[PDB]
Amino acid sequence: RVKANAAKRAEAKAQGVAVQLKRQPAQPRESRIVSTEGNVPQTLAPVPYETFI
Amino acid sequence: SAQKAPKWYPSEDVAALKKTRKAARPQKLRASLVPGTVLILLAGRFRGKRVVYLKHLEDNTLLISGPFKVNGVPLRRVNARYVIATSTKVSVEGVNVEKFNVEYFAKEKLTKKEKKEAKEIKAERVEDQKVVDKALIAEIKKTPLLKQYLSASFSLKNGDKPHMLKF
Amino acid sequence: VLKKNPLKNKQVLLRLNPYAKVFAAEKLGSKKAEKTGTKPAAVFTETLKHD
Amino acid sequence: PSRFTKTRKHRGHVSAGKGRIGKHRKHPGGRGMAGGQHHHRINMDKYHPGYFGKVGMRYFHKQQAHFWKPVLNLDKLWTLIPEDKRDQYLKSASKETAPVIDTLAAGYGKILGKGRIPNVPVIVKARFVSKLAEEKIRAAGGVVELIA
Amino acid sequence: TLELLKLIEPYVAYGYPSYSTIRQLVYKRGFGKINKQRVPLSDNAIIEANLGKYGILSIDDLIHEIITVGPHFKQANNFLWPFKLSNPSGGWGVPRKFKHFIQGGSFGNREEFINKLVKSMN
Amino acid sequence: GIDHTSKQHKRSGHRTAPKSDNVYLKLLVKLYTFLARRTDAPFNKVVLKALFLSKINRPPVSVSRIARALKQEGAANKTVVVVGTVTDDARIFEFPKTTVAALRFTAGARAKIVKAGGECITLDQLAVRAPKGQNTLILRGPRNSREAVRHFGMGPHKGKAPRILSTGRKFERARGRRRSKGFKV
RNA sequence: GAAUACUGCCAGCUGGGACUGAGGACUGCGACGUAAGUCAAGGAUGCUGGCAUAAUGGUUAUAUGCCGCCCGUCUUGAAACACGGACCAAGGAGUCUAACGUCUAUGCGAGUGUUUGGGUGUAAAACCCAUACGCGUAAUGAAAGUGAACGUAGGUUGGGGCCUCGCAAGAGGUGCACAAUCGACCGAUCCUGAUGUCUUCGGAUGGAUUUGAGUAAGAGCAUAGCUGUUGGGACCCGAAAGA
RNA sequence: AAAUAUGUAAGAAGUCCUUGUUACUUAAUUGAACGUGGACAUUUGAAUGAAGAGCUUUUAGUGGGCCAUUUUUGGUAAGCAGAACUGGCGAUGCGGGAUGAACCGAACGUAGAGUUAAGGUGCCGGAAUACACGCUCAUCAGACACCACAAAAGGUGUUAGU
RNA sequence: CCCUGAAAAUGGAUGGCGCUCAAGCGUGUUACCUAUACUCUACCGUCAGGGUUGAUAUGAUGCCCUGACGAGUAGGCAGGC
RNA sequence: GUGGCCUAUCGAUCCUUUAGUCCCUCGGAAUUUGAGGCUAGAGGUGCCAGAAAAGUUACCACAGGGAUAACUGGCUUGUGG
């Protein structure tokens, strides 16, 4: 990771300033659109009890 | 010496007050209190009397003349928080009340040396009452039972709930 | 010497946030929205009403 | 003075600072150096190692005056000259007229060599001298004469 | 931070605050940490003196940095003294607080109902 | 209730004033309190704090120590400041001409500096002629060369001096100090 | 095609009630006003009435409402069916001394300590003083013994303060105390063994995973105080015993 | 082969580039360790906090413990005996559990006001003889955790259900 | 849910009275009550950070500004009677 | 390869003794015996951080302990019923 950080900093020294070396924790998800085409939501309910004995 | 001394003493000069930001703005009265309204006195020597509201004086008092000819209440000031404003109204566009004010009602300078062990009305007051009361009565006679209503005293009967009563 | 609450005491409210005057003048707390007549898809309605 | 002691502060408090449970007693662990090898062993071994046992040989009827030999270092050697001839001798370092320092008269038995005297000749009279002390005196141009 | 909240679930009620809640919270109960002291904000010059190096010049800049989690959120949040709220004015709404919000209690994540709770608490 | 993360009502643990009742020391303290407040020079703050120190915390500074400090490159003309006592030293035979400001000069130290051509100065004269500690050089004596320090940290393998009244053979040089007598330390 | 419920927002308006009024010339931030000023804007002012004394208030006795088990002690646990205590006055228990540790104050400082003694006296005081002696300025070894600078009293890393350049940020220089570390020096141990020679003495030079309560531009001596330590009757009172 | 618990790292005492020392090491101008000089910008290399951070001296009391959840040993068991983690009591009042060291809530300068916690709201007793859907009638009903116990078994009592 | 199973010694204990479409049992929605807890304010003390000398109208261990904090046996220390 | 494949198989001060260095001391000065030192092992403490140690008291004493038995009570209920 130290080697990669040096490589990123040197590349940013040429182009793409503010390479933001630090790691980050997992972020909350961004917005998204979920299409129904071929994926119509369809599911059933909880199941009745039965013995299986 | 009995007691030694304080090494240093407080200053005896009086400190000036900081500037106060409290401007005196005029009272905003209740909506139901308009001149000509019949009031019910809840306190004082005239407890429970029906009177006529005439003028809002600059000391925040109300100038009332519950007609002296009717119930014996003269032209006098009352506190607005010690009256009940009723829905009954009398016209007051026939009376002249700009003369009555605080210096009109300025009582006296009672002398501290003046003392009483066991025990008249000003002249101008009676004609002022007569002049105001002439127009007041003239307007009062127009609708029946006002004279009787003003002569009668207000009181609470058994089962009366003033939080549900309409005055 | 004494903390005065904004959200009351409009003088302090105006000392902070000079934009409160424009907000109140233009009634930005009561903004009428532009109407639109887009309709949900029949698949959405059928899924919503499905058993 | 009694008025500054914690005894005055402890008035009104039952245990007088000694504790209700521990309850200050006479000699709960013994008297003096009792138990140095048994129940005070940890303190003895941690703070006074070498306390128990014998080392070395005895000397019957030792007289400390036999071993009288106070030491003087070269860096203090020039304080045996009174300060008012000191600067006069320090300038004009002369071999024909060099100060005589009688360290035995000053009360010393051996001259040691902590070193760096000024480069001035001096005649140092001593009972004993360390090898380095003599080498430094000779390097400065002086001499050590032995006395008894 | 989600792991931290999940580790302190039984003792906290938390959720997602709205702009109205954040603005009222900062306006009424917002105090700055200046030289280890709790200073009522009460003025924009205090904020520009202690957070002007991040481009935060007013109480609304501070609110903006909080509601939108900006680059200098950490500095602005740490500048804010922890808000000291009263007990809720209409109560907690439940007979027993120390169950999860899902189970009829008060603790845990109550995502958008934290707004109602905090509004009654301040 | 508050879940306290630190001890409450904790004193800073540093002296805010001299422990002594020396009136002249208190006058020096009030002078350097004014200077430390009305100037941004950290010299005044350092001198003010040193004015509070105890005797073991202000060890004497030898004139040989002063001469060695003045031998530093570019420090030949600086004013040596000792918040404490300057003692004499006979191990040195040459002494430079210099200004030394100190609380106290011993008779020998003062005589040696004056003979060398310099001057001995009090801290108030130092304050007058250098209100911001200009071209000063603060010197401190050896704190850990105190005899009490030898016994601090006594224990197995620590290499410290035992607290002992009589020395020599028969005095704590036996079992515990050599392998032939039990063990060694 | 609307309405309403539910939820949410307004830097929308407005009525009633309660507690509080800290501060004491001005300084600030604002607001309304062309400005002049004014304001609810870094904490209460204005108007009015009664009394001016037991009226308010304090104390005390009582009543009422609710609450309140006997202290001290040992104890995990006491109101205890645990022990001491009927009551009151007076007395009643961490002290002094020898030696000492840490800390602090003071004097003087490579020194320091007059008070064994002498001189003197306004006479157990105060004042003055020689030679010694104690501790300190050298350690190490069982001892015979030997005994502290290669060098700006060393190098490296930090290090306050100071200095130079900089509006600043900062960059350089110098860096006391202190901390870590590699060295150097003194003694002990082990090894090596020069010139020389009472031919068995002498021990030069050079080493070491060794060792010391050492050196490396001294800090100590004395007086006093709290706390702590040991011996003493030893915080106070208490045996069965022994001589 | 988990969960929980547990070690280390997430850089300036760092990284990279040239070349200096050695008596160690290499076949060797190979390395090892420590360095001179040069480069790295402000996201100097995750988050949150940091109440000042480090350092030293000296000395008190204590060295009988006990309780609760959870894990757990001996024992038929015990308000028994013995361990583990944590929180408590001891050393601690206050509101609640009538009463109670340890339970619940909450920890305490002196007051005022507001709001609550746990617990409650027929009367004692401050607060709905509230609202809503059901169940139960006991010739020994039942009525809030710790907690002041109840079982195997059985009933065309009555209710719902397969 | 109720009933049988269900027997102990002074008279007694859902805390008591009492309570039966409950004032019992299960559940749900509100309103209300009150801790030395939380919020705001005043005052006391403590701790911390600060201001104050072209004489601060001669107290600078004083005066003042700001913030936070306050349980306590054994025990320690401080200021006072 | 610095004992046993690893995890157990062992022992202070004083005294005695042996080995080593042929070294230091016997203090008026030497020589030789003798003695004492310095470094390293052994002789042993198993109550194993290491006193040198038989009973009895129904004639008994003292300091205490409900930190602890012999009676009630309390928890438990194996056993008993």
Ligand SMILES: C[C@@H]1C[C@@H]([C@H](O)CC2CC(=O)NC(=O)C2)C(=O)[C@@H](C)C1
């Ligand atoms: C059993 C026998 C003696 C024993 C030891 O010397 C006994 C005691 C004698 C004494 O009074 N004081 C002590 O310090 C030790 C020892 O060394 C063994 C090897 C041999």
Ligand SMILES: [Mg+2]
């Ligand atoms: Mg106490």
Ligand SMILES: [Mg+2]
């Ligand atoms: Mg008592």
Ligand SMILES: [Mg+2]
């Ligand atoms: Mg006691």
Ligand SMILES: [Mg+2]
């Ligand atoms: Mg004890």
Ligand SMILES: [Mg+2]
């Ligand atoms: Mg023993």
Ligand SMILES: [Mg+2]
């Ligand atoms: Mg309410």
Ligand SMILES: [Mg+2]
């Ligand atoms: Mg009672």
Ligand SMILES: [Mg+2]
């Ligand atoms: Mg007893």
Ligand SMILES: [Mg+2]
């Ligand atoms: Mg008795």
Ligand SMILES: [Mg+2]
């Ligand atoms: Mg008695």
Ligand SMILES: [Mg+2]
């Ligand atoms: Mg008495």
Ligand SMILES: [Mg+2]
């Ligand atoms: Mg006694």
Ligand SMILES: [Mg+2]
């Ligand atoms: Mg006997």
Ligand SMILES: [Mg+2]
């Ligand atoms: Mg005990």
Ligand SMILES: [Mg+2]
């Ligand atoms: Mg106890």
